[PDB]
């Protein structure tokens, strides 16, 4: 409801939205503020226009005041050009006059005047105070390069402190910032309740934090935690314009030390004291309602001559008022714009109607022109161009606090030289190093909730829980990733063991049934002793056969016994060695033929010791063999059926089965990998049946005494060795030992040694007794 016409038609008046009521403003600011800033603005205006050559010498000076508030706020916003355009009231003898109000203070408090100015076309935002959204952007900009995931929040009842917390709420998610707590502190807070929230603070273990509390609001907060003396704590004191003012007590920085906070350096107003000294009781021709509030705040029963010094010096608490400096800069910018349009080029604007920028102004549309796209360079600050989002933004002094043992106080460091606006850039401009607080501890090495676990692992996530907290769980078997903290766990090469990562390998030692290890030595010793005894029995045989008793007995019998032992032992030697498919083709028929002809020699010895008889006729064959050809062809027919069935399974399809080991996980052993070998089992069974034959001829040998009782030994040795071989063959066929060490080899070598001990030893003794054989 105030109305302050002043030097020039541009009249910077109207009700100030920062005041919400007559009583509010009377007992909030004026009772001890009090509207002196506009007096300083008018000073600057008057001597600047004396400096200027007739800047705007059009209208006069006059102050008339009459003090929700929306009705009178808009009514004081009402100029006179709006209510006299046509307005043909027969009783209104109106005349042309144009005032125009621009200044708005406390715009955040009341937005109805802003809406009125929007609808009328006279919108003028200069809140001239920089908004807290830029401070939230700055706190985010210090979030990224700290390289830390979550952070805590503390707020208060301040109206300006809310938009920061909501903005943090909608910006945290897209760049994984987690919030553990965000609680309000009032002017007075309960004791046990504050203890409860701080207790859940230690419960949360969210050590990094940002506080939006004001000075008197944060003073109790620094007070309570002194009692328990937990002092590893770091803060982020935003909007810390009054840095170390209410926290200046000693032993407090033992808890609240090392805090980094934003600040704005404010240029001191030249002659502020003498600016405020001019107001005196009842010598004031202008601003009569300055006089009324002076009367009503100092009730006027008495006190009609006191000065400001006589009053209780109300100019110590506010040495430099933020709103005063902001409106000072705003009015300076407006005056500079007025000077500019007084000295602008001859040219026109962008608007269609009201395009009259001359010595006489129409609706003050050039002022917004010079605000939007022109520099200011006022009050030794070098201000940026006025913008809607940010009016006048300077370099934010991110101050750091250091304890001073020599002074017992806090020293400030301008090491933070940065701003979020695009005047210097969107990137980093902060100095991080060469500072300390009881050591180098602000890096907070354990600010991340989860650690970098060992390679090959999932940072398993709790469902419905922020991605910051992850616990590491081990990748499935046979799969391992190289670098740590790998979400895409990948397959690992099969060349290493579990190697503290639970991996798998396929390349290991391969059993070739012969190695430098002692089993190979033992089997080689058995083989060489067998070969040596075969050589010795060959020598004794060649000794026996040199005598002319040859062809009086059957030399072919012993000759084929020697061939049988040689081939059966050759099969035993072929049994060991590196196993492949070609070795199996060279081995299996050899095994079959060795078995069948060794056993055929046994049978031909058992059935008839002496020569066979047959008819004497001339045929294709020779005559001297005296019937041995039938025994030869019987053994031969066995040999054929064996090798022809061998070639039958050869040419049809090579006998290769699936590659199998003892265990597919860690054991890689090459085997025969041939197959079931049904016909091989059939011929083995036929050989066993042939061994079962000629038992009764062995019995016809038990009755009669033959050649001084040698065939009985053959008979019982037959029995015992055949049964032991047939009892130990399925153990080899079933037991796992065949992989580690073949049992068939030892079984067959023992059987062959027994078979030779059946007759060779006995008749060697006999010929040692009687050489005539």
């Amino acid at each position: 409801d105030q109305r302050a016409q002043k030097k020039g038609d541009i009249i910077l008046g109207g009700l100030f939205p920062i005041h919400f009521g007559v009583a509010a403003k009377d007992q909030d600011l004026k009772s001890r503020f009090r509207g002196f800033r506009w007096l300083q603005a008018m000073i600057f205006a008057i001597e600047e226009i004396n400096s200027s050559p007739a800047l705007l010498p059009n209208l006069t000076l006059g102050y008339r005041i009459f003090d929700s508030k929306a009705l009178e706020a808009t009514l004081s916003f009402v100029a006179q050009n709006k209510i006299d355009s046509l307005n043909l009231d027969e009783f209104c003898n109106c005349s042309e006059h144009i005032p125009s109000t621009i200044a708005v203070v406390g715009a955040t408090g009341s937005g109805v005047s802003t809406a009125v100015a929007n609808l009328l076309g006279l919108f003028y935002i200069p809140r001239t105070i920089p908004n807290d959204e830029h401070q939230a952007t700055a706190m985010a900009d210090i979030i990224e390069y700290f390289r830390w995931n979550w952070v805590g929040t503390i707020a208060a009842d301040d109206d300006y402190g809310r938009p920061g917390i909501e903005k943090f709420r909608e910006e945290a998610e897209e760049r994984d910032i987690c919030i553990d707590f965000s609680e309000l502190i009032s002017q007075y807070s309960d004791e046990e309740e504050i203890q409860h929230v701080v207790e859940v603070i230690q419960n949360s273990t969210a050590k990094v934090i940002v506080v939006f509390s004001s000075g008197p609001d944060l003073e109790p907060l620094i007070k309570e935690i002194v009692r328990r003396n937990i002092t590893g704590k770091i803060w982020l004191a935003s909007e810390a314009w009054a840095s170390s003012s209410l926290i200046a007590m000693p032993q407090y920085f033992h808890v609240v030390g090392g805090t980094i906070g934003f600040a704005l350096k404010a240029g001191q107003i030249p002659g502020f004291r003498e600016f405020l000294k001019k107001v005196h009781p009842r010598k004031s021709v202008h601003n009569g309602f300055a006089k009324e509030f002076w009367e009503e705040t100092f009730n006027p029963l008495c006190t009609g001559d006191e000065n400001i010094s006589s009053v209780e010096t109300p100019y110590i608490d506010y040495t430099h008022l933020r709103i005063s400096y902001n409106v000072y800069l705003a009015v300076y910018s407006i005056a500079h714009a007025l000077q500019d349009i007084y000295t602008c080029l001859p040219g026109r604007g962008l608007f269609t109607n009201g395009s009259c920028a001359d010595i006489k102004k129409v609706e003050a549309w050039q002022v917004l022109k010079h605000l939007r796209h022109l520099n200011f360079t006022n009050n030794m600050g070098e201000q940026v161009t006025f913008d809607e989002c940010g009016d006048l933004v300077g370099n934010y002094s991110i101050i750091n606090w250091h304890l001073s043992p020599e002074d017992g106080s806090i020293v400030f460091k301008e090491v933070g030289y940065y701003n979020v606006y695009a005047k210097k850039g969107e990137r980093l401009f902060i100095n991080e190093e060469k500072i300390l607080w009881s050591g180098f501890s602000r890096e907070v090495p354990f600010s991340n909730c989860s650690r970098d676990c060992l390679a090959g692992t999932r940072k398993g996530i709790i469902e419905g829980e922020p991605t910051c907290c992850f616990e590491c769980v081990e990748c499935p078997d046979g799969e391992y990733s190289d670098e740590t903290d790998a979400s895409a766990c990948n397959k690992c090469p099969d060349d290493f063991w579990s190697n503290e990562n639970h991996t798998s390998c396929i390349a290991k030692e391969i059993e070739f049934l012969s190695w430098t290890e002692p089993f190979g030595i033992a089997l080689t010793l058995f083989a060489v002793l067998g070969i040596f005894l075969t050589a010795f029995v060959l020598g004794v045989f060649i000794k026996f056969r040199n005598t002319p008793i040859v062809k009086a007995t059957n030399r072919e019998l012993s000759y084929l016994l020697l061939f049988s032992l040689l081939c059966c032992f050759s099969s035993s030697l072929f049994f060991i060695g590196e196993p492949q498919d070609w070795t199996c083709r060279l081995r299996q028929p050899a095994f079959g033929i060795s078995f069948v002809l060794c056993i055929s020699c046994i049978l031909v010895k058992t059935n008839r010791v002496l020569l066979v008889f047959e008819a004497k006729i001339p045929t294709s064959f020779h005559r001297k063999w005296w019937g041995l050809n039938l025994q030869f062809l019987l053994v031969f027919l066995c040999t054929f059926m064996q090798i022809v069935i061998c070639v039958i399974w050869l040419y049809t399809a090579p006998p290769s089965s699936y590659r199998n080991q003892e265990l597919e996980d860690e054991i890689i052993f090459i085997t025969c990998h041939e197959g079931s070998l049904m016909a091989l089992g059939f011929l083995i069974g036929y050989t066993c049946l042939l061994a079962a034959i000629c038992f009764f001829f062995a019995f016809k040998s038990r009755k009669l005494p033959e050649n001084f009782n040698e065939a009985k030994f053959i008979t019982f040795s037959m029995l015992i060795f055949f049964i032991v071989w047939i009892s130990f063959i399925p153990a080899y066929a079933s037991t796992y030992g065949k992989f580690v060490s073949a049992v068939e080899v030892i079984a067959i070598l023992a059987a062959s040694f027994g078979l030779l001990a059946c007759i060779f030893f006995n008749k060697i003794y006999i010929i040692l007794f009687k050489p005539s054989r």
Partner: nanobody
Amino acid sequence: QVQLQESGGGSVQAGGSLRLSCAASGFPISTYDMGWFRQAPGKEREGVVGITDSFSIKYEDSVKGRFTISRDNAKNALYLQMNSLKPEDTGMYYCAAGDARWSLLLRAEQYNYWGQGTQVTVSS
């Protein structure tokens, strides 16, 4: 950027049970909670129960034994189960969002967000 809708509005007896389920849209509940209050239509809004973003709960003198409140971060919605209710169950359940104190949430006017205020008249 916060939205909510009421569900489970039905009429039961004095000893009957009432189920209320409300799912948030476009706003995770991790940052802050979503308080619920019970206003008799035609008079001032009263807060029977109070949720805390730290998963704490705060009840008035008579709430014990009849109200159960369920809220979780994973599902970001709120359940209100009522049993052995007082005979005059007529009222409107109002949902509010905004940082405040324990007494401030008990009075329930510090919340900036205002819900639609769906009402069910049990009248039993």
